């Protein structure tokens, strides 16, 4: 058993009635002086090191050639200037195991933490040395953390693409299904998560072909996708689609392997009309989509279900099956208890505050349920015919660290620089053989700036997650993020002289987006929270009015700007609590070969133990209230894990989900039971 693991294990051995939290500091110190520092490669100087890495195909030559070597030296100097030390074994372990560049044989380490940051910053700044130094400071102070794909691969030659999220529409044909599978594997190889909308695919019995897929409906397509992934995959289906019960039964524990889907995540899209039909206890119907396309010349999930539902029911050329809508909502709650699946998207909560309904309404979401954008189906054809390209979704992500941003008083600076980094990654992306995704990147230019360390920050300032004080902080914080995000998007539009495709018809352009911001104040109501924002200018209704006019004049470069991802791996590197979620465990036990490892939550001690309250003991109604408060100021979505007990009944699970719906929650993610 290595010394660093032994020292890490001594945290759980009590001393004077307390956990030995400081033993983690010894553990990480041992990890460096007994392992990491013995496996790093020596170089005489920075010039030799960089020439070696370029010439041996580790780094790309072009992004470095934009700087003079003297300027590169100064950027690297900036990274090593602040004496960065990991506070825990796991934070250091997660960087050097998952992110640090290794030699090709993978026996030595070629990058310190400061080297990766220096290279990522030199990639972002595109020759601008002074901006590269700001990126280094932003990342070394841990104010901003680029997503895994960007942070891992930026500046490297042997790599995937830097984009995290891909969402694909799939039209109703074998050529389309075949192309969607091909594109999914291509994009998954590039390092991104891939989510597929299956709501336009024809239901069971509508496929009259002698192929293995035919007779199972969309489950056949789910199987092909699931097998291919053996980046991860997801599939979404509208609740009014006939195959909804078969779609759900892929995640049953008792389901046989010919129907079962193990790797692929699943999501269900629920409009209000289904919630209306659940409220009044009467039987409802699910539709065979190809019959709807035959009749109306439009896909089911493109048409307005509030208006057309009764018309689909009364039309005899539209085929249907009767269901009990309350019992399907019960089934959803039950599967989420057993499996964690499916994810739920409350479609009208997404679309009632969506800025770009004129392009399209939002029909589905991504692998982690936070990306929420317009899309349009493509039509892929054979050799001698022409493809008709629609609009898929791509979004590259990054996260603010709330703790460090507040302590450095740098909300404006970090949001605007992060937005610039996300914009450069979007500009330098080059997707081949997926023109609907290429269209998304070039024309829509969406980015996904999120945040982590909410609970960690609140807990270390004596603010409980469920308190009105916490919601007061979140309200003001994310308002500010949205303000400076929009401002920078509009500034970039002025500088570049470009806007996102069909900006002119958006709620940003009409002014409607800003209505609540020009009329209501979002500064902190509690004095304790107002003192935390001391030194930072909190935008007022008057600033918002001025921003509204600025946007009306110059437009906006980005179609979407903000979304809060789960941050599973990167949160360790940041010594941060995951996302805006409440923590699961005060101390995480995990396996390490034969031995165990222990990770106390970042900033956990005996004197703040109360404030690091475990998510399972919280009231999920009050957790809903927190995320709803954040969702006000996020144009896309928030990955909302729900934390449950086996004591809860199906009745209790339905009441939580229906309350989430009532408060305007856009999506809910994996359902976690203790
Ligand atoms: N916690 C932590 N994070 C990062 N790097 C670390 C850490 N502990 C030790 N080291 C590395 C940094 C130096 O190269 C050397 C001496 O660190 P010194 O601080 O002089 O003991 O070990």
XYZ file of C-alpha atoms and ligand atoms in Angstrom:
696
model
C 0.000 0.000 0.000
C 1.600 3.331 -1.124
C 2.334 5.966 1.557
C -0.038 8.530 -0.014
C -2.922 6.008 0.225
C -2.000 5.109 3.846
C -1.966 8.818 4.779
C -5.290 9.334 2.964
C -6.789 6.410 4.959
C -5.710 8.074 8.254
C -8.412 10.765 7.705
C -11.011 8.200 8.902
C -8.968 7.208 11.996
C -10.309 9.489 14.761
C -8.182 11.799 16.921
C -9.629 13.831 19.837
C -13.145 12.930 18.582
C -12.584 14.479 15.108
C -11.709 13.252 11.626
C -8.082 14.022 10.724
C -8.856 16.265 7.737
C -5.257 17.571 7.533
C -3.959 14.030 6.766
C -5.251 14.577 3.197
C -2.710 17.442 2.841
C 0.078 15.007 3.839
C -1.348 12.358 1.461
C -1.218 14.709 -1.554
C 2.288 15.907 -0.579
C 3.432 12.252 -0.544
C 1.713 11.649 -3.918
C 3.968 14.344 -5.442
C 7.319 13.729 -3.665
C 7.041 9.880 -3.787
C 5.345 9.386 -7.220
C 4.519 12.327 -9.544
C 7.869 14.136 -9.165
C 9.688 10.823 -9.842
C 7.769 10.209 -13.118
C 7.937 13.643 -14.797
C 10.296 14.060 -17.766
C 13.271 16.411 -17.413
C 13.977 19.109 -20.014
C 16.905 21.572 -20.023
C 14.603 24.520 -20.831
C 11.148 25.453 -22.191
C 12.413 25.789 -25.797
C 13.789 22.229 -25.836
C 10.565 20.930 -24.242
C 8.225 22.615 -26.751
C 10.381 21.671 -29.781
C 10.397 18.050 -28.539
C 6.588 18.005 -28.127
C 5.959 19.598 -31.551
C 8.520 17.412 -33.391
C 7.303 14.162 -31.728
C 3.623 14.872 -32.593
C 2.277 15.637 -29.084
C 1.355 19.303 -29.697
C 0.195 21.109 -32.841
C 2.779 23.471 -34.382
C 0.436 26.163 -35.741
C -1.087 27.628 -32.537
C 2.410 28.029 -30.995
C 3.833 29.620 -34.193
C 1.455 32.607 -33.708
C 3.608 33.711 -30.710
C 7.271 34.668 -30.417
C 9.130 32.310 -28.057
C 9.794 35.205 -25.642
C 6.001 35.704 -25.388
C 5.448 31.939 -24.843
C 8.050 31.997 -22.025
C 6.176 34.879 -20.319
C 2.837 32.998 -20.543
C 4.363 29.868 -18.936
C 6.002 32.118 -16.312
C 2.517 33.495 -15.460
C 1.225 29.929 -14.856
C 4.055 29.023 -12.430
C 3.939 32.437 -10.635
C 1.133 31.662 -8.122
C 2.353 28.496 -6.315
C -0.720 26.364 -7.044
C -1.151 23.478 -4.601
C -3.865 20.805 -4.658
C -5.656 20.667 -1.259
C -6.571 16.952 -1.600
C -5.164 13.682 -2.936
C -8.169 13.133 -5.230
C -7.966 16.577 -6.889
C -4.305 15.977 -7.801
C -4.952 12.313 -8.654
C -7.811 13.199 -11.017
C -5.716 15.751 -12.944
C -2.582 13.604 -13.362
C -4.512 10.404 -14.151
C -7.178 11.831 -16.519
C -5.793 15.112 -17.980
C -1.970 15.331 -17.788
C -0.200 14.542 -21.069
C 1.732 11.258 -20.905
C 4.423 9.849 -23.193
C 3.154 7.539 -25.987
C 4.023 4.390 -23.976
C 2.239 6.120 -21.007
C 5.099 5.523 -18.532
C 6.214 9.150 -17.854
C 4.355 12.473 -17.415
C 5.029 15.388 -19.816
C 2.813 18.122 -18.278
C 2.445 19.669 -14.849
C -0.951 21.266 -14.094
C 0.608 24.631 -15.025
C 1.754 23.329 -18.454
C -1.755 22.174 -19.485
C -3.156 25.589 -18.451
C -0.387 27.404 -20.372
C -1.118 25.420 -23.552
C -4.918 25.798 -23.200
C -4.453 29.562 -22.694
C -2.121 29.881 -25.719
C -4.730 27.970 -27.772
C -7.610 30.247 -26.652
C -5.857 33.593 -27.182
C -4.941 33.015 -30.871
C -1.676 35.032 -30.810
C -2.802 37.677 -28.276
C -0.108 37.295 -25.593
C -1.761 39.609 -23.039
C -5.096 37.771 -23.393
C -3.261 34.431 -22.996
C -1.898 35.718 -19.653
C -5.457 36.590 -18.541
C -6.572 33.047 -19.491
C -3.672 31.607 -17.444
C -4.621 33.745 -14.423
C -8.310 32.886 -14.865
C -7.505 29.136 -14.908
C -4.662 29.069 -12.313
C -6.842 31.043 -9.839
C -9.477 28.369 -10.653
C -12.106 30.987 -11.561
C -12.953 29.179 -14.843
C -12.714 25.492 -15.810
C -13.097 24.483 -19.477
C -14.996 21.216 -20.055
C -13.175 17.876 -20.201
C -12.838 17.708 -24.039
C -11.494 21.273 -24.334
C -9.232 21.045 -21.259
C -7.890 17.574 -22.204
C -7.258 18.067 -25.933
C -6.626 21.804 -26.566
C -3.228 22.209 -28.261
C -2.687 18.457 -28.850
C -2.243 16.817 -32.273
C -3.513 13.296 -31.534
C -7.011 14.232 -30.346
C -10.759 14.386 -30.800
C -12.729 17.618 -31.200
C -13.208 20.047 -28.287
C -17.061 20.044 -28.348
C -18.913 18.213 -25.536
C -22.536 18.003 -26.708
C -24.104 16.841 -29.968
C -27.854 16.409 -30.520
C -29.206 14.746 -33.686
C -32.653 14.752 -35.284
C -33.476 11.503 -37.145
C -35.912 11.369 -40.084
C -38.186 8.393 -40.796
C -36.085 6.260 -43.185
C -33.431 3.515 -43.253
C -30.993 5.913 -45.006
C -31.544 8.462 -42.199
C -31.202 5.860 -39.410
C -28.046 4.487 -41.082
C -26.574 8.009 -41.396
C -27.493 8.874 -37.768
C -25.622 5.766 -36.545
C -22.590 6.665 -38.716
C -22.611 10.280 -37.478
C -23.063 9.108 -33.856
C -19.912 6.937 -34.026
C -17.947 9.715 -35.773
C -18.955 12.312 -33.154
C -18.482 9.829 -30.267
C -14.921 9.173 -31.540
C -14.353 12.970 -31.512
C -15.009 12.829 -27.706
C -18.534 14.297 -27.581
C -21.764 12.951 -26.110
C -24.453 12.222 -28.714
C -28.219 12.405 -28.142
C -30.810 11.327 -30.732
C -34.435 12.423 -31.103
C -36.496 9.345 -32.083
C -39.955 11.027 -32.025
C -40.193 11.251 -35.864
C -39.460 7.521 -36.357
C -42.458 5.342 -37.237
C -44.040 3.200 -34.516
C -44.240 -0.608 -34.218
C -46.032 -2.230 -37.192
C -45.590 0.776 -39.529
C -42.309 -0.612 -40.953
C -43.198 -2.998 -43.806
C -39.705 -4.332 -44.626
C -37.911 -7.673 -44.210
C -35.213 -6.414 -41.815
C -34.378 -7.319 -38.193
C -35.354 -3.808 -37.009
C -38.865 -3.637 -38.590
C -41.132 -5.457 -36.109
C -39.871 -3.885 -32.813
C -40.494 -0.172 -33.626
C -38.025 2.373 -32.170
C -36.602 -0.324 -29.814
C -34.922 -1.791 -32.921
C -33.192 1.561 -33.527
C -32.291 1.857 -29.803
C -30.637 -1.587 -30.012
C -28.523 -0.574 -33.042
C -27.439 2.630 -31.255
C -26.777 0.820 -27.944
C -24.633 -1.839 -29.674
C -22.694 0.777 -31.670
C -21.508 2.605 -28.507
C -19.976 -0.714 -27.333
C -18.351 9.498 -25.873
C -21.650 8.047 -24.592
C -25.145 7.968 -26.152
C -28.726 9.026 -25.384
C -32.160 8.766 -27.020
C -35.294 10.892 -26.498
C -38.964 10.185 -27.268
C -42.100 12.324 -27.033
C -44.663 10.860 -24.602
C -47.470 10.899 -27.235
C -45.442 8.484 -29.447
C -47.023 4.956 -29.654
C -43.811 3.084 -28.719
C -43.513 5.028 -25.371
C -44.185 1.883 -23.263
C -41.647 -0.198 -25.260
C -39.179 2.738 -25.064
C -39.489 2.702 -21.254
C -39.290 -1.129 -20.986
C -35.707 -1.114 -22.369
C -34.586 0.045 -18.871
C -36.530 -2.531 -16.783
C -34.310 -4.684 -14.530
C -36.371 -7.782 -15.471
C -36.331 -7.162 -19.268
C -34.593 -9.811 -21.425
C -31.431 -8.866 -23.351
C -32.945 -8.747 -26.889
C -35.082 -5.767 -25.699
C -32.778 -4.388 -22.938
C -30.592 -1.280 -23.455
C -27.656 -1.071 -20.999
C -25.248 1.624 -22.240
C -27.661 4.163 -23.770
C -29.372 6.804 -21.603
C -33.074 7.541 -22.243
C -35.242 10.667 -21.968
C -38.968 11.422 -22.290
C -40.399 14.723 -23.592
C -43.696 15.708 -21.915
C -45.893 18.605 -23.122
C -48.533 20.292 -20.904
C -51.386 18.585 -22.808
C -50.301 15.227 -21.317
C -50.160 16.829 -17.836
C -53.675 18.263 -18.490
C -54.896 14.772 -19.493
C -53.279 13.355 -16.325
C -54.942 16.015 -14.104
C -58.484 15.123 -15.223
C -58.621 11.337 -14.714
C -59.701 10.219 -18.208
C -58.119 7.886 -20.777
C -55.782 9.399 -23.393
C -54.175 8.262 -26.665
C -50.716 7.721 -28.184
C -50.187 8.065 -31.921
C -48.578 6.185 -34.807
C -46.434 8.975 -36.309
C -46.250 7.818 -39.961
C -50.083 7.950 -40.182
C -49.876 11.585 -38.967
C -47.218 12.361 -41.627
C -49.366 10.676 -44.334
C -52.411 12.724 -43.303
C -51.003 16.195 -42.522
C -47.635 16.286 -44.357
C -45.922 17.271 -41.080
C -44.222 15.228 -38.351
C -46.126 14.660 -35.076
C -43.537 16.358 -32.824
C -43.341 19.442 -35.120
C -47.097 20.120 -34.774
C -48.740 21.897 -31.813
C -50.165 19.134 -29.587
C -52.389 21.472 -27.495
C -54.359 22.306 -30.660
C -54.021 19.108 -32.724
C -54.574 16.393 -30.037
C -58.389 16.213 -30.398
C -58.032 16.513 -34.195
C -55.677 13.473 -34.245
C -58.198 11.564 -32.078
C -61.205 12.368 -34.317
C -59.313 11.699 -37.599
C -59.937 8.045 -38.630
C -56.876 7.961 -40.959
C -54.677 8.610 -37.868
C -54.006 5.347 -35.965
C -53.999 5.198 -32.133
C -53.797 3.131 -28.941
C -55.674 4.079 -25.753
C -53.725 4.453 -22.478
C -54.243 5.582 -18.882
C -52.215 8.838 -18.586
C -52.023 8.830 -14.751
C -50.674 5.249 -14.725
C -47.976 6.186 -17.271
C -46.854 9.043 -14.962
C -46.769 6.456 -12.146
C -44.698 4.112 -14.362
C -42.228 6.969 -15.063
C -41.787 7.518 -11.313
C -41.325 3.760 -10.709
C -38.650 3.263 -13.411
C -36.758 6.329 -12.152
C -36.775 4.736 -8.661
C -35.399 1.392 -9.975
C -33.060 2.451 -12.810
C -32.593 6.245 -12.592
C -34.201 6.551 -16.053
C -35.721 8.127 -18.000
C -34.788 11.793 -17.905
C -37.863 14.047 -18.162
C -38.176 17.212 -20.243
C -41.194 19.396 -19.476
C -41.449 20.764 -23.030
C -43.695 23.800 -22.401
C -41.529 25.023 -19.490
C -38.642 24.992 -22.000
C -40.611 26.676 -24.792
C -42.519 29.343 -22.785
C -39.144 31.086 -22.049
C -37.312 29.959 -25.220
C -35.789 32.861 -27.170
C -35.813 31.220 -30.628
C -39.232 29.553 -31.164
C -39.298 31.258 -34.592
C -36.425 28.920 -35.652
C -38.109 25.950 -33.969
C -39.529 24.928 -30.604
C -37.239 22.757 -28.439
C -38.139 19.076 -29.009
C -35.506 17.139 -27.001
C -32.282 17.437 -24.959
C -28.732 16.025 -24.721
C -26.881 13.242 -22.810
C -26.996 15.229 -19.513
C -30.350 17.014 -20.128
C -29.053 20.656 -19.940
C -28.766 21.591 -23.657
C -32.095 22.998 -24.883
C -32.165 24.511 -28.367
C -34.078 24.681 -31.631
C -33.452 21.957 -34.227
C -34.741 20.855 -37.641
C -34.725 17.373 -39.182
C -32.521 16.592 -42.202
C -33.355 14.228 -45.054
C -30.433 11.977 -45.999
C -30.603 10.205 -49.380
C -28.616 7.780 -51.557
C -25.734 8.447 -54.043
C -27.573 9.939 -57.035
C -30.002 12.057 -54.914
C -29.408 15.232 -52.855
C -29.381 15.514 -49.046
C -31.707 18.185 -47.603
C -29.910 19.512 -44.512
C -31.754 20.823 -41.445
C -30.231 21.816 -38.110
C -28.657 19.627 -35.425
C -27.237 21.058 -32.169
C -23.626 21.384 -30.991
C -22.479 23.133 -27.804
C -19.000 23.409 -26.269
C -19.044 23.814 -22.489
C -17.159 25.381 -19.592
C -17.891 26.172 -15.927
C -17.365 29.078 -13.531
C -16.062 28.156 -10.078
C -18.440 30.117 -7.825
C -16.111 30.067 -4.770
C -13.079 31.610 -6.516
C -15.116 34.011 -8.710
C -16.760 35.515 -5.585
C -13.483 35.731 -3.597
C -11.659 37.358 -6.562
C -14.741 39.608 -7.197
C -14.458 38.726 -10.884
C -17.980 37.828 -12.135
C -17.817 40.279 -15.084
C -14.214 39.483 -16.067
C -14.616 35.686 -15.799
C -17.964 35.460 -17.655
C -16.668 37.642 -20.512
C -13.282 35.863 -20.826
C -14.942 32.429 -20.544
C -17.363 33.506 -23.292
C -14.343 34.482 -25.461
C -12.705 31.063 -24.857
C -15.941 29.246 -25.736
C -16.285 31.421 -28.866
C -12.743 30.603 -30.095
C -13.281 26.841 -29.601
C -16.552 27.183 -31.557
C -14.784 29.103 -34.370
C -11.934 26.554 -34.665
C -14.262 23.487 -34.753
C -14.301 21.628 -38.106
C -16.909 18.845 -38.248
C -16.757 16.715 -41.429
C -19.495 14.404 -42.784
C -22.246 15.754 -40.500
C -23.452 18.943 -42.269
C -26.459 19.473 -39.955
C -23.942 19.695 -37.060
C -21.587 21.843 -39.179
C -24.569 24.141 -39.870
C -25.227 24.345 -36.101
C -21.637 25.339 -35.360
C -21.203 27.918 -38.159
C -24.707 29.467 -38.236
C -26.051 29.167 -34.643
C -22.731 29.507 -32.753
C -24.143 28.251 -29.413
C -22.057 27.988 -26.218
C -22.737 26.560 -22.747
C -21.236 28.504 -19.849
C -22.191 26.769 -16.582
C -21.140 26.923 -12.934
C -19.841 24.674 -10.147
C -19.158 24.884 -6.386
C -22.513 26.428 -5.314
C -23.049 24.286 -2.221
C -19.324 24.416 -1.361
C -19.332 28.229 -1.481
C -22.585 28.559 0.518
C -21.459 25.995 3.115
C -18.141 27.819 3.743
C -19.984 31.150 4.310
C -22.522 29.717 6.804
C -25.444 29.572 4.345
C -27.593 26.412 4.218
C -28.526 25.072 0.746
C -32.283 24.973 1.535
C -32.383 28.459 3.145
C -33.929 31.570 1.521
C -30.460 33.141 1.919
C -29.007 30.586 -0.543
C -31.756 31.191 -3.126
C -31.180 34.951 -2.686
C -27.466 34.509 -3.551
C -28.218 32.249 -6.539
C -30.826 34.734 -7.854
C -28.367 37.647 -7.937
C -25.323 35.555 -8.967
C -26.843 33.986 -12.102
C -28.613 37.233 -13.053
C -25.134 38.796 -13.187
C -23.802 35.845 -15.211
C -26.642 36.334 -17.704
C -26.136 40.123 -17.886
C -22.407 40.005 -18.706
C -22.869 36.957 -20.971
C -25.421 38.837 -23.115
C -23.274 41.992 -23.010
C -20.220 40.109 -24.300
C -22.291 38.260 -26.924
C -23.504 41.682 -28.143
C -19.965 43.146 -27.957
C -18.652 40.239 -30.082
C -21.505 40.840 -32.569
C -20.377 44.492 -32.836
C -16.666 43.594 -33.263
C -17.211 40.728 -35.743
C -20.189 42.400 -37.478
C -22.110 39.094 -37.311
C -25.146 37.737 -35.481
C -26.449 34.176 -35.057
C -28.663 32.886 -37.875
C -32.146 34.441 -37.568
C -31.266 36.660 -34.579
C -33.735 39.197 -36.051
C -36.796 37.086 -35.119
C -35.591 36.204 -31.584
C -37.002 37.524 -28.302
C -33.628 39.280 -27.842
C -34.333 41.322 -31.013
C -37.982 42.174 -30.207
C -37.020 43.151 -26.618
C -39.420 40.627 -25.024
C -36.513 38.677 -23.459
C -35.652 41.670 -21.244
C -39.195 42.435 -19.909
C -38.695 41.103 -16.359
C -35.128 42.493 -16.221
C -36.175 46.073 -17.114
C -39.136 45.968 -14.669
C -37.801 44.004 -11.636
C -34.646 44.231 -9.481
C -32.518 41.127 -8.782
C -30.052 42.530 -6.189
C -29.865 40.633 -2.858
C -32.743 41.172 -0.400
C -30.816 39.782 2.612
C -27.973 41.926 4.029
C -25.670 38.913 4.600
C -25.780 38.065 0.867
C -25.409 41.729 -0.212
C -22.107 41.886 1.743
C -20.712 38.963 -0.323
C -21.237 41.035 -3.523
C -19.426 44.058 -1.980
C -16.860 45.385 -4.483
C -18.737 44.081 -7.547
C -21.222 46.278 -9.396
C -24.619 44.546 -9.328
C -26.524 45.340 -12.576
C -29.753 47.308 -12.084
C -32.975 47.673 -14.103
C -31.359 50.734 -15.727
C -28.277 48.737 -16.835
C -30.603 46.093 -18.300
C -32.496 48.824 -20.246
C -29.158 50.058 -21.629
C -28.194 46.451 -22.527
C -31.582 45.936 -24.241
C -30.882 48.982 -26.449
C -27.284 47.834 -27.086
C -28.577 44.408 -28.217
C -31.316 46.024 -30.364
C -28.594 48.015 -32.171
C -25.777 45.429 -32.531
C -27.543 42.068 -32.092
C -25.985 38.979 -30.510
C -23.325 36.563 -31.804
C -24.543 33.486 -29.879
C -27.935 31.777 -30.288
C -27.535 30.242 -26.801
C -25.021 31.070 -24.055
C -25.620 29.322 -20.694
C -26.269 25.793 -19.437
C -25.300 24.028 -16.188
C -23.709 20.597 -16.796
C -23.069 17.961 -14.056
C -19.227 18.434 -13.995
C -18.419 14.864 -12.882
C -14.642 14.711 -13.451
C -13.504 18.364 -13.563
C -15.066 19.231 -10.162
C -12.368 17.143 -8.427
C -9.575 19.059 -10.235
C -11.270 22.309 -9.130
C -11.790 21.116 -5.506
C -15.442 21.965 -6.066
C -18.869 20.524 -5.250
C -20.573 19.104 -8.349
C -22.445 21.685 -10.438
C -25.190 23.643 -8.594
C -26.318 20.372 -6.929
C -26.236 19.598 -3.211
C -23.521 17.097 -2.219
C -24.404 13.385 -1.949
C -21.848 12.376 0.679
C -19.758 14.421 3.115
C -16.959 11.835 2.664
C -16.758 9.702 -0.518
C -15.337 6.172 -0.200
C -13.955 4.825 -3.517
C -11.787 1.832 -4.521
C -8.116 2.174 -5.560
C -6.702 -1.153 -6.777
C -6.832 -3.182 -3.552
C -6.982 -0.165 -1.199
C -9.705 2.417 -0.497
C -9.546 6.199 -1.006
C -11.427 8.870 0.945
C -12.504 12.287 -0.328
C -14.054 14.776 2.106
C -16.054 17.494 0.328
C -13.857 20.521 -0.524
C -13.768 22.845 2.502
C -15.376 20.304 4.871
C -14.407 20.574 8.545
C -15.892 19.912 12.001
C -16.988 23.567 12.412
C -18.942 23.683 9.091
C -20.161 20.026 9.132
C -23.796 21.183 9.524
C -23.654 23.266 6.337
C -22.401 20.318 4.203
C -25.825 18.668 4.554
C -26.283 15.537 2.433
C -28.761 15.841 -0.463
C -30.847 12.806 0.570
C -31.800 14.476 3.897
C -32.936 17.702 2.173
C -36.495 18.508 1.113
C -36.579 18.022 -2.691
C -39.297 20.713 -2.868
C -36.746 23.245 -1.552
C -34.066 21.880 -3.934
C -36.592 22.449 -6.768
C -37.006 26.054 -5.515
C -33.213 26.576 -5.751
C -32.890 25.318 -9.334
C -36.033 27.197 -10.436
C -34.405 30.393 -9.080
C -31.235 29.640 -11.097
C -33.290 28.616 -14.191
C -34.715 32.177 -14.399
C -31.285 33.374 -15.538
C -30.193 30.393 -17.696
C -31.418 30.456 -21.316
C -30.885 26.683 -21.800
C -31.138 24.065 -18.974
C -29.671 22.663 -15.759
C -28.716 19.026 -15.075
C -31.026 18.315 -12.120
C -30.203 15.110 -10.233
C -32.935 14.167 -7.728
C -31.918 12.535 -4.441
C -34.428 10.053 -3.002
C -34.977 7.511 -0.214
C -36.462 3.992 -0.492
C -39.024 5.144 2.130
C -40.688 7.356 -0.541
C -43.792 6.049 -2.345
C -44.778 6.452 -6.015
C -47.274 9.083 -4.770
C -44.375 11.056 -3.217
C -42.262 10.749 -6.390
C -45.119 12.062 -8.575
C -45.660 15.027 -6.205
C -41.962 16.048 -6.481
C -42.023 15.835 -10.306
C -45.364 17.689 -10.572
C -44.026 20.394 -8.208
C -40.926 20.721 -10.424
C -43.307 21.123 -13.356
C -45.371 23.740 -11.471
C -42.294 25.860 -10.581
C -41.123 25.898 -14.244
C -38.345 23.268 -14.183
C -37.141 22.586 -17.734
C -35.648 19.094 -17.234
C -34.822 16.458 -14.613
C -31.781 14.179 -14.885
C -30.759 10.795 -13.290
C -32.904 9.810 -10.283
C -30.619 8.912 -7.375
C -31.799 6.630 -4.519
C -29.645 6.098 -1.401
N -0.426 19.561 -2.778
C 0.406 19.714 -3.810
N -0.094 20.165 -4.983
C 0.743 20.324 -6.018
N 2.053 20.092 -6.085
C 2.517 19.645 -4.905
C 1.784 19.434 -3.752
N 2.599 18.966 -2.730
C 3.788 18.906 -3.279
N 3.810 19.301 -4.595
C 4.946 19.357 -5.516
C 5.300 20.765 -5.977
C 6.817 20.763 -6.008
O 7.307 20.330 -7.280
C 7.188 19.768 -4.913
C 7.421 20.376 -3.548
O 6.217 21.004 -3.063
P 6.203 21.830 -1.702
O 4.921 22.578 -1.643
O 7.487 22.563 -1.575
O 6.163 20.785 -0.646
O 6.086 18.837 -4.842
